[PDB]
Each structure stands twice: as structure tokens, then as C-alpha cells.
Design a protein around this ligand. Structure first.
Ligand SMILES: CC(=O)N[C@@H]1[C@@H](O)[C@H](O[C@@H]2O[C@H](CO)[C@H](O)[C@H](O)[C@H]2O)[C@@H](CO)O[C@H]1O
Length: 278
């Protein structure tokens, strides 16, 4: 045991509403040199009956060196399904579970590793728990099926200074490029974020009164076809701080007065699984 703060195990959370197709559950944490295993469960129960059905049990085992999936229903477990555990005792873990109408899609380190077909109703999932040799650093459930091209207004204050736009996406395995535009009311694009795999660069520019600006590239593309990524756009005093998978990828000096950035567009060869203003 080391440090508590938030998300101490055993962690138990009652969902506000049913886990529905299109939603994702993200669990990040750290393990220790002596961690043996930890579990993640999507379980039934109305309030806290404890002992009901378990519509997806995930066991990450360091001893066995495998990630094991199973279901518990009507008082009994089914046959386990296994995949290799890419993690060594220690080092951080990143597990993501996305619900679909016929299965759960599980990713480890943002890489799809398992398609678990529903064995019992997904609607039975009313709670999720995490326990074992793990220190939880981040837990989030939400998202939906975002259609792309995508377009929407941003809150009432939009991407204002001191705030950040968080986007969870996966560039398509056979995609060439995709883009994310942060714009103003008149249609000017404050920031154009455009990953181009066929050019091995991410282009950043601004569209002002119908004309494209300079264009800032270079900085080694941190994205990869078919792998999930967490993109963060932090609106700061002098520039947008662009983070990719937790690391600052670049800075982009404001060319348009910040403030009043309440427009978002996403297009190209990409799948979007979550968008949030933090
Ligand atoms: C469909 C569309 O308008 N796409 C444009 C991109 O073509 C454009 O890329 C730049 O294009 C110019 C020529 O017009 C030149 O080739 C640059 O090297 C290239 O980066 C991009 C940036 O202006 O804006 C998109 O909207």
C-alpha cells in the first residue's frame, strides 16, 4: 500500500445510469514490484446486495502472466477466456472497456486485445469495482458513439483560458489523415490540428477570414494507426498546450484572441469515443 488520496481500493461505484453501447470505462493505475494481481468487475446489484451477477470479470495476473475474462451468473462462473498480460510487475496500467451491442471491446495500453461477447444482459451492469494490488490514478466512464464528421458547440463559455478540451480517439487502421478544428463564431478556426500519417507529421494552422496561415509542423508524430490516443487541448495565456497521451506534443501561439472558442469539428479517418471539457 502506498498513498491514498482518491480512488482507494477496494473501489466500488454505482452507475448513475445503465452502461450502454458506445460508452467506455477507463481505468488507469500503478502497480508495485510485489503486486500479484488485481481485478476489474462490472457487476449487478441494485444498491449493495453483493453476490449478484457479474457481467464481465477481468483478472490481470502477474503470477500467471495473463489477463483473464469471465462471467458469473445464476450462482456460477462460466469458462474463462485468456490473453497474454503485457505488463511486468510495476509499471503503469491502462485498461479500457467499451460496450457495444454484442460484446465488450477491451484495450490494454490503448491497443484492442479482447472482444468479449455478452454472455448475460449488459443492462444488468449497475456497478463497477476495482480491487487488488493496484493504486488507481484515473477512472472515467462515459462517451458514446460519436458520428464523424462531427460538429458541435462548446458549452456556454467554450474552451476558455484555464480550460482544456479532452478527446479520446483512434486513428483508423487504414486511415491517411484526420483533423480537429477549434473555432470561433464567425467560422474562423483558432486551431486546426491535422495529423497526416502519409506525411509523418501533424500540421497545425489557423483559418482567418477564409485564408490559411503559416502552418507549424515537425515534432515527430506521436500517433499511430489503430491505436487509441488521449488528445488534450489546453487553452493557456499565450498558447494552446497540446498534449498527446499525457505528454506535451507542442505549443501553438494564439493567432486569434482566445476566449469565445465554442465550436468544434472533427473529420477525416478517425473514430471518436469521448469528448470532455475539463
Ligand atoms: C480540403 C482542404 O481545403 N484541405 C486543406 C489542405 O489542403 C491544406 O494543406 C495545405 O495546402 C496547401 C495548398 O493549398 C499546401 O500544399 C500546403 O503544403 C498544405 O499544408 C490545409 C492547410 O492550409 O488546409 C486544409 O483545409
Amino acid at each position: 500500500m502506498a498513498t491514498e488520496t482518491n480512488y482507494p481500493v477496494p473501489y466500488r461505484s454505482k452507475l448513475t445510469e445503465p452502461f450502454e453501447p458506445g460508452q467506455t470505462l477507463i481505468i488507469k493505475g500503478k502497480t508495485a514490484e510485489d503486486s500479484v494481481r488485481f481485478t476489474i468487475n462490472l457487476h449487478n446489484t441494485s444498491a449493495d446486495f453483493s453476490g449478484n451477477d457479474v457481467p464481465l470479470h477481468i483478472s490481470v495476473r502477474f503470477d500467471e502472466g495473463k489477463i483473464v475474462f469471465n462471467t458469473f451468473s445464476k450462482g456460477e462462473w462460466g469458462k474463462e477466456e485468456r490473453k497474454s498480460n503485457p505488463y511486468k510487475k510495476g509499471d503503469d496500467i491502462d485498461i479500457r472497456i467499451r460496450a457495444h451491442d454484442s460484446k465488450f471491446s477491451i484495450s490494454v495500453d490503448q491497443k484492442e486485445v479482447k472482444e468479449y461477447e455478452h454472455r448475460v444482459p449488459l443492462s444488468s451492469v449497475t456497478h463497477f469495482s476495482v480491487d487488488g494490488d493496484i493504486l488507481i490514478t484515473y477512472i472515467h466512464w462515459g462517451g458514446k458513439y460519436y458520428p464523424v464528421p462531427y460538429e458541435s458547440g462548446l458549452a456556454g463559455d467554450g474552451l476558455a483560458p484555464g480550460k482544456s478540451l479532452l478527446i479520446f480517439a483512434t486513428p483508423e487502421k487504414k486511415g491517411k489523415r484526420f483533423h480537429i478544428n477549434l473555432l470561433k463564431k464567425n467560422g474562423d478556426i483558432a486551431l486546426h490540428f491535422n495529423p497526416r500519417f502519409d506525411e509523418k507529421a501533424i500540421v497545425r494552422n489557423s483559418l482567418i477570414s477564409g485564408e490559411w496561415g503559416n502552418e507549424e509542423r515537425e515534432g515527430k508524430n506521436p500517433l499511430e494507426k489503430g491505436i487509441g490516443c488521449d488528445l488534450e487541448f489546453r487553452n493557456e495565456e499565450y498558447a494552446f498546450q497540446i498534449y498527446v497521451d499525457g505528454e506535451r506534443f507542442a505549443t501553438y501561439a494564439h493567432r486569434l484572441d482566445p476566449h469565445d472558442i465554442n465550436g468544434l469539428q472533427i473529420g477525416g479517418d478517425v473514430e471518436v469515443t469521448g469528448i470532455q471539457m475539463v
